[PDB]
Amino acid sequence: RPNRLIVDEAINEDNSVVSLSQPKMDELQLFRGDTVLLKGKKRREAVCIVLSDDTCSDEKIRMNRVVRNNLRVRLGDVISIQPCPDVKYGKRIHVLPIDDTVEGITGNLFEVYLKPYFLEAYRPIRKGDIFLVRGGMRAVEFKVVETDPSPYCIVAPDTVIHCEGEPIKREDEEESLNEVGYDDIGGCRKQLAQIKEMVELPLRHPALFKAIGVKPPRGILLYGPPGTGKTLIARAVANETGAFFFLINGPEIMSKLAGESESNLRKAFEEAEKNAPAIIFIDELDAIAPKREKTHGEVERRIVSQLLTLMDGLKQRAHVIVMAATNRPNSIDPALRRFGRFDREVDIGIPDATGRLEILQIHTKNMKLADDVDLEQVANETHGHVGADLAALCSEAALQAIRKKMDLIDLEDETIDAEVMNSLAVTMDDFRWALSQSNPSALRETVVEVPQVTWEDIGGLEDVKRELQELVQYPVEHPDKFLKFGMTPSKGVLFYGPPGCGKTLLAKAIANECQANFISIKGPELLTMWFGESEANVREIFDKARQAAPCVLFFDELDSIAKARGGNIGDGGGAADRVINQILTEMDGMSTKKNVFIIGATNRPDIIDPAILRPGRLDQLIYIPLPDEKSRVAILKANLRKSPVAKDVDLEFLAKMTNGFSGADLTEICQRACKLAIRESIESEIRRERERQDPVPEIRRDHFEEAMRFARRSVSDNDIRKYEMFAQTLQQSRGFGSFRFPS
Amino acid sequence: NGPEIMSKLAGESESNLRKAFEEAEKNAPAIIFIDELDAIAPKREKTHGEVERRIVSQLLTLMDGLKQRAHVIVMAATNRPNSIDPALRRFGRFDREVDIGIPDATGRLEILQIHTKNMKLADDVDLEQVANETHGHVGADLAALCSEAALQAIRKKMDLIDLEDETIDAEVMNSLAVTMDDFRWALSQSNPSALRETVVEVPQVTWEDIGGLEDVKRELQELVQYPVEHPDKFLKFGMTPSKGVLFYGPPGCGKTLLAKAIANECQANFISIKGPELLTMWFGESEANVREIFDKARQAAPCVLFFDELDSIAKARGGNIGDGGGAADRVINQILTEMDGMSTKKNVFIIGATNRPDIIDPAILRPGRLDQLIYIPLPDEKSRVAILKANLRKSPVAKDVDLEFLAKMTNGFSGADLTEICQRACKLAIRESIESEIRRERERQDPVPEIRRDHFEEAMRFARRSVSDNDIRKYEMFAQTLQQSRGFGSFRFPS
Ligand SMILES: CN1CCC(NC(=O)OCC#Cc2c(F)cc(OCc3nnc(S[C@H]4C=CCCC4)n3-c3cccnc3)cc2F)CC1
Ligand SMILES: CN1CCC(NC(=O)OCC#Cc2c(F)cc(OCc3nnc(S[C@H]4C=CCCC4)n3-c3cccnc3)cc2F)CC1
Ligand SMILES: Nc1ncnc2c1ncn2[C@@H]1O[C@H](COP(=O)(O)OP(=O)(O)O)[C@@H](O)[C@H]1O
Ligand SMILES: Nc1ncnc2c1ncn2[C@@H]1O[C@H](COP(=O)(O)OP(=O)(O)O)[C@@H](O)[C@H]1O
Ligand SMILES: Nc1ncnc2c1ncn2[C@@H]1O[C@H](COP(=O)(O)OP(=O)(O)O)[C@@H](O)[C@H]1O
């Protein structure tokens, strides 16, 4: 039937709202705000309000867990839409707390949860349907029980809502909504999409491999630092097939004396498959099956080497998936990751500045987060916090709001009523304290990110941005033309230009335009590998890129080692280096990998191994010049955009003065102006406090006059001419001007 | 198959292993595959338990018992040979090792063609393109890829047919045209985490891709191909032909291409050890890795080793001072030590390429080692025409490009520089073609199907001679140092 679509992940946390592709709406005979009735796979029906997001395809309709398992429809299945509303808003509608969600809760939970969720929204309700409302640090779901016999009803002023109490819990047909799903993972939407695409076919349709000859993914190996959310992701995926997955987590297996483990492990495989498709999560495979190279007892060696043989047995059929988990892949015995034994590794990795924001929003979603929580600010403030840490933080703050409210309410247990738990407005002061307490001791390792900088933050460089758009973006949006001519485009760039001029910013902005996984390897990170004589770590770095593709590597200060030598003498690399040589060795390898882009930035382009400028390696050198007057205007505007500035600052003059400022120097002028602005503003707020014992709400033209006096050109003209000299060495003309193939 | 044997508690394995030998021979000739012998019989040097030592050392005694008769074969398997206890590879105990090795650019194409053979591979699958695209994919990965593509064609068709199992009919499975877009996605997903190690290959380059060098190709045909197709004449005179060459010549002039083409003409297993690969061994103070490299050649024969930038270490020293090798080096010295050993191996040919022939251990030019120095000169005008034609052969070029003039300009371009001119012409061609396809898209909101004489006019303006005349004369000076004449001109044994 054409009145059907496929359910997909929600765009918003609110329930009762369903997104439809705007082109699909009219053909579906639905309009901008109509009531979208829904008929699920089972003999189960519900209703929602229409919405639209242009990212939705005509195939997809977005429904979150509150609506999906209300139709008993797993994610990715067919939902039928049957619009036919009545005009009779519900009368005497009713609901109960017949659920385990209200364990220990006291007070009039009806007043705090149900009444605002109903009257503030005036949303459509249908009897028999479970609905989740979050607040008071609890997610409480109730099963409607009366709506009048109408197929749908909308709560309104004449809807005299009702409530009653009973002890009966949810039915077997109802999903345990207190446990995770797809919407409970925020930091790794890319890897989550990879995993769900990778295992939607075996698990949703295990027969769909049973019959055809393709061999399904028999083993997935999630990995990433502990607390990254690996077990969360596996549990979220398995909550579509949670018949027997849960009992089969295997971190305890390795620790039962001798064969008691080997027996247990067997049973773990034996019982997981016994009913429905099932996921067998080998939690902390790093411990059960470590590299045999570093074992000192045959009993543990036999444990690991009969993990493999129980793995191989599952190659016969598709309904079972062995989703392992580990801190890093090279800590496990390579006897795994064979064809059929954990064939597909997946790096969950630490969340980025926007992944942590999504994690914080996911965890806070049941807390009354107040009206001053700058989530975006803490998300950048909490760099390095791996996954579960943002979960601890979101509790450390919440508790900081309880322990500072539990003095007012002197109760000895939370038989304190839910209404005052709803009053726990967890202000940003509490989160400020919690961050000060929180420690990112899970890990802080080379971080792969989708940087949030964009062209509007790269003032000037009008030519270079075009020259990089036609270099990173043309070969990935018209590869037909690159095959038609056999070009083999350049998988490399070297930004040579004065330091502090916008090379790293350009690389981040490029990675952002393509929405690619930027991986910055700063100067100290390379120089440390050279110092420790541990150039082998480079093999790890590039490997991360090989896993993070589509990536944009970036070796900031790629000439760091050559500068830290002088480039003239040394037993070692002469002109070359340990780590630069390893970088060449790995660039040659990754020249195959079409997805990853490699960028380097050299503020000393003459002093650097010329072997890196060879074709295939960072071949396309791009000059990043000192900004000219107009580009200096652009840079000043870019840096002042994020700060309040009086409406009479003459920036076109502030650019004229800066005869040759690098971009960093103009940023430093902006920062000196800000510092002098807080000086002049603090020294008038404290003056006001003394008076009582917004002076200036913005920086002004006055403050720049003392901000500029601390200014430089961070590159002498003897360096500007050094880069011009390197350009003319690498501009490569030799009097072919006016050359023409004669007619 | 015996991968499970090592993991059954104590004697339960030792009994099982015996039964494995006992029952394999019971009917007809039978192969006994000791899967992952790396694990069952590791080097006893790195064991910490007597029971595992006894497992490995009663693998040997069950091996020996099979020397009595021929019908049973014990085909072991291992990641690498030196990880197994040398108690194996004795006479009669795994006497014959065989390196399957990673597939080459045409091996991977054959693997892909084998695995795709049941998939409706559509009409736009550039198998040859993915075969080069998928470098480093070891065997079964191309099998996973060939599934990742196929599934990418199912999961994008299973929306149309909303069935819950493949009781979907075979007819619409035949309609799963796995387009090259699906394989493009699958390659982006696929990871060659099996291994990426020094790759032995039969290169697909040939003479037609080596523009010019008409003299050098003959001089190498009579040097690598005469001693292997007329060895009667080399024994008849007792010549002991040269198992070595050093290509000294300006960098980026066609030395590695010549070596690959030579290996291809003989259909030999080329093994390139690039400059960074030697320089890495010298940095890590792990010259012992060279013993591995040459060993690969000893297993991959008929081979053509190739030490690109054989003077890499000397350049990375300056060749004047150092505690270390003075004029010599760690890794160059190890290379000499192994060249002396491999001078026995008749099948393998050893080639080196030096763009800095003066700064390199002269001990490597000794007879038996890379003795026959061959000069790889900068292309002359006709050879530049040849190089330009060779590089533009694979790309569409308008039928009015005046290549015999584009050669005249490039008074001293190396081969790499002319290839860079070709690549700049291509880059400006996509620029001018993309900027008219997007223009067409804006119009509706094949401009030029080929590069043209127009684009080379902006492609050439970014050109070099990558060697100054002070380097051309440096190589001429090294040649006259190694041309070795001293006025025996007109010398004649008088009648
Ligand atoms: C003249 N002689 C003739 C014969 C022979 N020539 C031939 O016949 O070969 C044909 C080809 C090709 C081709 C390509 F080489 C790259 C492509 O695009 C992939 C891509 N995907 N993402 C990226 S980067 C991007 C990913 C997003 C996040 C950041 C980075 N790239 C990409 C981009 C830039 C450079 N490299 C790869 C497509 C092709 F079709 C040799 C020369
Ligand atoms: C003047 N005093 C008199 C007495 C004494 N002299 C004497 O009596 O010795 C006689 C001899 C010989 C001989 C030989 F020395 C090499 C041969 O061919 C093997 C071969 N097979 N493949 C190759 S390379 C090719 C394999 C294909 C893939 C790539 C590489 N080669 C080969 C080719 C070039 C150089 N070396 C070996 C045959 C012979 F008969 C000492 C001097
Ligand atoms: N990417 C993420 N998105 C949402 N929650 C996360 C994420 N990563 C970690 N968490 C939080 O961490 C906890 C899961 O930790 P767990 O998976 O048990 O440890 P590990 O990740 O090491 O297996 C959950 O409470 C979850 O809310
Ligand atoms: N072109 C530019 N436009 C705007 N800001 C710039 C520009 N170039 C540099 N900056 C400023 O300099 C800093 C980044 O310097 P960076 O580009 O990393 O220098 P380098 O790459 O030479 O180390 C940022 O704070 C940014 O505000
Ligand atoms: N004689 C030649 N004929 C055709 N192409 C050549 C020639 N010499 C070099 N090239 C080009 O140069 C590249 C190979 O350079 P290479 O021979 O490896 O230089 P080097 O051996 O000095 O490193 C190829 O892209 C090839 O197109």
Author numbering:
A (entry chain A): 22 to 714, 726 to 775
B (entry chain F): 270 to 714, 726 to 775
List sentences from the manuscript.
The molecular mechanism of p97 ATPase has been extensively studied with a variety of methods, including X-ray crystallography, nuclear magnetic resonance (NMR) spectroscopy, and single-particle cryogenic electron microscopy (cryo-EM). A stable and functional oligomer of six p97 monomers assembles without a requirement for binding nucleotides. This homohexamer structure appears as two concentric rings, formed by the D1 and D2 domains, that create a central pore capable of binding protein and peptide substrates for segregation or degradation. The triazole inhibitors bind between the D1 and D2 domains and at the interface with an adjacent monomer.
The two-dimensional (2D) class averages of p97 | NSC799462 showed that both hexameric and dodecameric forms are present, similar to previous observations on the wild-type or mutant p9747,62,76–79. The final reconstructions reach resolutions of 3.23 Å and 3.33 Å for hexamer and dodecamer, respectively. NSC799462 binds at the interface between the D1 and D2 domains of the adjacent p97 monomers. The inhibitor does not directly interact with bound nucleotide, but its methylpiperidine group approaches the D2 nucleotide-binding site of an adjacent subunit with a distance of approximately 8 Å between the methyl group on the piperidine of NSC799462 and the 3’-hydroxyl group of the adjacent ADP ribose. The interactions between NSC799462 and p97 are primarily hydrophobic, involving surrounding residues V493, P496, V497, P500, L504, P510, I531, C535, A537, P571, and F618. K512 and N616 make hydrogen bonds with the pyridine and triazole nitrogens, respectively. In the presence of the inhibitor, a significant structural change in the loop T613-V617 is observed (inset), which allows NSC799462 to fit the binding site and enables the interaction of N616 with a triazole nitrogen. The width of the binding pocket increases to accommodate NSC799462: the distances between N616 and V497 and between K512 and P496 increase from 3.2 Å and 3.9 Å to 6.7 Å and 7.4 Å, respectively. These rearrangements expand the volume of this binding cavity, induce subtle shifts of the surrounding structural motifs, and result in the helices, α2 A, α2B, α2 C, and α2E moving outwards.
